[PDB]
Amino acid sequence: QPGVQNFLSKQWYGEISRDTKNWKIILCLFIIPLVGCGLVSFRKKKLLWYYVAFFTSPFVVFSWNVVFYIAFLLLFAYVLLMDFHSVPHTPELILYALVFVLFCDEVRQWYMNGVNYFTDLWNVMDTLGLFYFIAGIVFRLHSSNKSSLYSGRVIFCLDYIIFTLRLIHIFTVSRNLGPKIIMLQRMLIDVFFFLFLFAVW
Amino acid sequence: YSGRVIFCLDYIIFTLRLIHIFTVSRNLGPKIIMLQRMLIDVFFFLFLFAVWMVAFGVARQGILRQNEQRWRWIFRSVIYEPYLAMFGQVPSDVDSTTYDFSHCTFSGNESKPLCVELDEHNLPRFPEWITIPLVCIYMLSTNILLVNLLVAMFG
Amino acid sequence: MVAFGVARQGILRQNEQRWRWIFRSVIYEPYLAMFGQVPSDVDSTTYDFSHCTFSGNESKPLCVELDEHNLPRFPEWITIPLVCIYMLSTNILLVNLLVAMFG
């Protein structure tokens, strides 16, 4: 109902006024100074408080996390394709640190919930990705051998596929792509029938 | 020649104005107007396509070749070939060990793709049983399912 | 087709002076691109030469312009995106739109 949606939108934008356009707030996110300016309108209510409100909003936190995840994917790809060696270099250690941060957050989410946590597909995929990353690390530290390194690299590539596919899940709140992403679940039986006939033939 | 290229791009821009000027025909006009309403479906299609291309290209490049060190060929192998896969071309002739070699360079001197990693014996080191299913799934998702979904949304 | 063919022909080759090959390069190849064929093997510098004539004596497409060194002069970073966009618009979007309108 519209009332609950408006309440959720107000919570989502936090202090920032919902009347503000998204591109303005994104631009102010990318360049800090403009938040001190009047480009972004704060409905609820000194620059210090302005910045605190701007950076306490879950909307901005989500956007920042998306940027961080994209940068993490870029670093992962660069390490995998261009700077993979017998002994890990600095970028790979940074990647390990970022994955450790993701793992600690995942453990927090584990503890908050119970075994119902693993009843969702995406949580299972996250756990699988972390486990495969750990397995790749284990394989890759046998630098003397020339086959364990490549096994770890393949593990990392599959894990990269799994990591990349999470973007679809995280972009289900866009209000333009979300409904269409949701609608894909309803179309699986047609695919099953198609594959059945195709396989028989 | 720089001026000639500028003129060619300007010619593209000039030619595209015919669509705007022919929006008063009463037969083509409404259909031309209706194209504005269909951009979000295109955006969703491109979003899924780009995600899948990135994943597949990175995985394949990492599994076949190591340490390219060339940006142009990195982007050619990661982005261009999966993109062409949408039009019916199998993404890689290198996905199968049979169709390999004689089109590679061990050193980046030549304008050829980097050669696949080799084991202690001089034979390719990647496993076909991983690559082939990968390419099969990618082609199935891109060529067939996504295009039909776009058709349905347009309808 | 008109836009893409004129742009590509101007960017690759200069002063054809032959009408038949002008229309073959400008109209025929983009038209075939609708049926799944990539418009040009010449859009990429790797797949070029040995199928060209510097003079119009032979029944071959005119050779691409060359720089002070004997290497092709066009930029791939312009041609390849052009062909990508053209194929995307023609092969996929337009045909699906036609299907929808027919329905």
Ligand SMILES: CC(C)CCC[C@@H](C)[C@H]1CC[C@H]2[C@@H]3CC=C4C[C@@H](OC(=O)CCC(=O)O)CC[C@]4(C)[C@H]3CC[C@]12C
């Ligand atoms: C660090 C570098 C390498 C990344 C630059 C690439 C950009 C194209 C990416 C980075 C940050 C991304 C943005 C971060 C947050 C958002 C908001 C998002 O819109 C919403 O989620 C609205 C949610 C709602 O309406 O409730 C659309 C994508 C956008 C602009 C993301 C789209 C693409 C951006 C601009």
Ligand SMILES: CC(C)CCC[C@@H](C)[C@H]1CC[C@H]2[C@@H]3CC=C4C[C@@H](OC(=O)CCC(=O)O)CC[C@]4(C)[C@H]3CC[C@]12C
């Ligand atoms: C280039 C390779 C080797 C490294 C992988 C980088 C990717 C993480 C980059 C490349 C292309 C980018 C994407 C191109 C298109 C989109 C959709 C876009 O979605 C929206 O902005 C929705 C906005 C709205 O709904 O209004 C978010 C960014 C994303 C995934 C871009 C951000 C990140 C991507 C996947």
Ligand SMILES: CC(C)CCC[C@@H](C)[C@H]1CC[C@H]2[C@@H]3CC=C4C[C@@H](OC(=O)CCC(=O)O)CC[C@]4(C)[C@H]3CC[C@]12C
């Ligand atoms: C041939 C190349 C090298 C030079 C470029 C010439 C173009 C400007 C010519 C070639 C094909 C012609 C087009 C073929 C089809 C049409 C649609 C036509 O639209 C209508 O007549 C609508 C009538 C109605 O709605 O009833 C107008 C002319 C146009 C653009 C023709 C006029 C001009 C075009 C684009």
Ligand SMILES: CC(C)CCC[C@@H](C)[C@H]1CC[C@H]2[C@@H]3CC=C4C[C@@H](OC(=O)CCC(=O)O)CC[C@]4(C)[C@H]3CC[C@]12C
């Ligand atoms: C569920 C849908 C989306 C995928 C169905 C497509 C099939 C055609 C795929 C699925 C599993 C694939 C098979 C999995 C494993 C192999 C062994 C492979 O043979 C080898 O290369 C072995 C190499 C060696 O022995 O060293 C040939 C392909 C095949 C039958 C793959 C070929 C294509 C298959 C049958």
Ligand SMILES: CC(C)CCC[C@@H](C)[C@H]1CC[C@H]2[C@@H]3CC=C4C[C@@H](OC(=O)CCC(=O)O)CC[C@]4(C)[C@H]3CC[C@]12C
């Ligand atoms: C937004 C949609 C409709 C287009 C997305 C399709 C992509 C596959 C296109 C868009 C930008 C293109 C890239 C822009 C520039 C280059 C460099 C080019 O390398 C060169 O030829 C450089 C030549 C030199 O160094 O002298 C190879 C293609 C690439 C990655 C192009 C290949 C195809 C790309 C990624």
Ligand SMILES: FC(F)(F)c1ccccc1-c1cc(C(F)(F)F)c2[nH]c(C3=NOC4(CCCCC4)C3)nc2c1
């Ligand atoms: F129209 C469509 F969307 F196809 C589709 C239509 C109807 C029902 C399901 C789908 C669908 C949805 C998704 C999801 F939304 F879940 F992503 C799909 N994902 C994939 C693949 N995943 O990874 C691949 C690319 C990366 C390499 C491995 C293979 C392809 N195929 C999907 C089919």
Ligand SMILES: FC(F)(F)c1ccccc1-c1cc(C(F)(F)F)c2[nH]c(C3=NOC4(CCCCC4)C3)nc2c1
């Ligand atoms: F069904 C369709 F129409 F595809 C379409 C369907 C749904 C949404 C948008 C479009 C659309 C519309 C137009 C426009 F109506 F605005 F023209 C397009 N124009 C182009 C290109 N412009 O120039 C190119 C040819 C010349 C060389 C450069 C590339 C292709 N692609 C479009 C896609």
Ligand SMILES: CCCCCCCCCP(=O)(C(C)C)C(C)C
């Ligand atoms: C195999 C999937 C890996 C998921 C690992 C958990 C990452 C969570 C993604 P995020 O929480 C952001 C903090 C990167 C998303 C909601 C923006």
